Amino acid sequence: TQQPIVTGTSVISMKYDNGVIIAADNLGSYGSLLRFNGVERLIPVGDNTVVGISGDISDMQHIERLLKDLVTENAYDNPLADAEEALEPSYIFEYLATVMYQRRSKMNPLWNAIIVAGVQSNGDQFLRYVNLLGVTYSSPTLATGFGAHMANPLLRKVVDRESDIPKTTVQVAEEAIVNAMRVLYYRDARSSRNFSLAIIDKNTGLTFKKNLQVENMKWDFAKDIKGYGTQKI
């Protein structure tokens, strides 16, 4: 039995024609206090997988260590560790999902919601979610926390079903993700303006973007808003 202390908010993601995109802000909240501002919640594994984690940050750092140790262990007595027998997104996901379900079954969970985004060896897009309960699901768009309530509706307007994935380009998909992160900054009280974004493409590989900011915001109309009903001044 735990309670989360230092926490990370939404992780959002989607599939496009040649790969997947995933994003998450760089904040570590301490309740209502926006305590830590240089927190990376996207963690690459190899050159074909990115694990996006929300929830308890101490448990996130533990998972970072497990994934880093997983890469080491896979390289042992493995001449094809950088080729055919390299770590796949599906391998990394199933490992975490096994751990998360085992921990919930011992009543000592890792207080996280995780999204594993990547591209398989055959070019297929991989996008799957797992949380502190060991619950798993996949979808063309996936999001955690507030992202589930606000981002998914925007991302599902682009990719509403499986057949919409080949029709969606990386430019359009990135635009939707960046737009969603702005909406979360408007409406999520435990979000930050600064965020990281990662693209895993089957052709151009892994592109990891740090120190992004929400921009092109609309605040001007606020000056015209006066009082809460009757007040004219």
Partner 1 sequence: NNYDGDTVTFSPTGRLFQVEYALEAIKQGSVTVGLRSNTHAVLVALKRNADELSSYQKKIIKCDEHMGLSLAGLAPDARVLSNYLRQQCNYSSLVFNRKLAVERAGHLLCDKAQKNTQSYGGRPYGVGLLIIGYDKSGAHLLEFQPSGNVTELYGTAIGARSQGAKTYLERTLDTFIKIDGNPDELIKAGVEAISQSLRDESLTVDNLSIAIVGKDTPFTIYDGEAVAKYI
Partner 2 sequence: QFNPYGDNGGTILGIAGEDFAVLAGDTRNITDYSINSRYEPKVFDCGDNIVMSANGFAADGDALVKRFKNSVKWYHFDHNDKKLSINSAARNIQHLLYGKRFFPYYVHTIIAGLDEDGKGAVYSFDPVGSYEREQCRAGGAAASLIMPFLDNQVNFKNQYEPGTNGKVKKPLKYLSVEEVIKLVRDSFTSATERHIQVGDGLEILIVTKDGVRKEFYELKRD
Interaction of residue 163 with partner 2, rule CB under 8 A: no
Whole-angstrom Cα distance, residue 117 to residue 141?
11
- Identify which range of 22-30, 49-57, 84-92, 206-214 contacts partner 1 by CB under 8 A: 84-92
* Residue 61 binds partner 1 (CB under 8 A): no
In the complex, what is the shortest distance from the CB of residue 98 to partner 1, in angstroms, rounded to a whole number? 5
Minimal distance, residue 88 CB to partner 2, in Å: 19
Of 1, 7, 72, 207, the catalytic one is 1
User: In the chain, where do the E strands start and end?
Assistant: 6-8, 11-16, 19-25, 28-30, 33-36, 42-44, 49-56, 112-119, 125-131, 136-138, 141-143, 194-201, 205-213
Among partner 1, partner 2, none, what binds residue 219 when CB lies within 5 to 8 Å by partner kind? none
Q: Specify whether 1 is catalytic.
A: yes
Token output for 148: 């589930």
| Residue 146 is a binding residue for partner 2 (CB under 8 A) | no
Q: Is 95 in the site for partner 1 (CB under 8 A)?
A: yes
C-beta of 83 vs 222, nearer to partner 1: 83
From the list partner 1, partner 2, none, partner contacted by residue 37 (C-beta under 5 to 8 A by kind): none
Asked if residue 94 binds partner 1 (CB under 8 A), the reply is: yes
CB of 174 to partner 2, least distance (A): 23
Residue 64 exposed, middle or buried by CB count within 10 Å (0-12, 13-18, 19+): middle
- The residue whose two tokens read 């209502």 is 32
C-beta of 134: minimal distance to partner 2 in Å?
4
- Contacts (Cβ under 8 Å, ≥6 apart) of 5: 30, 56, 57, 58
User: Counting every residue, how long is the chain?
Assistant: 233
User: What are φ and ψ of residue 55, in 5° steps?
Assistant: 95, -150
Q: Does 90 bind partner 1 (CB under 8 A)?
A: yes
Single residue of 9, 26, 29, 139 touching partner 2 by CB under 8 A:
139
> What per-residue string of b and e applies to 15-28 under the rule 16 or more CB within 10 Å gives b?
bbbbbbbbbbbbbb
CB-wise, 98 or 213, nearer to partner 1? 98
- SS3 sequence of 53-111: EEEEHHHHHHHHHHHHHHHHHHHCCCCCCCCCCCCCHHHHHHHHHHHHHHHHHCCCCCC
Residues annotated as part of the active site: 1
Binding residues (CB under 8 A) for partner 2: these are: 1-2, 101, 104-105, 107, 109, 129, 133-139, 148-149, 152, 161-162
Contact set with partner 1 (CB under 8 A): 77-78, 80, 84-85, 88, 90-91, 93-95, 98, 121
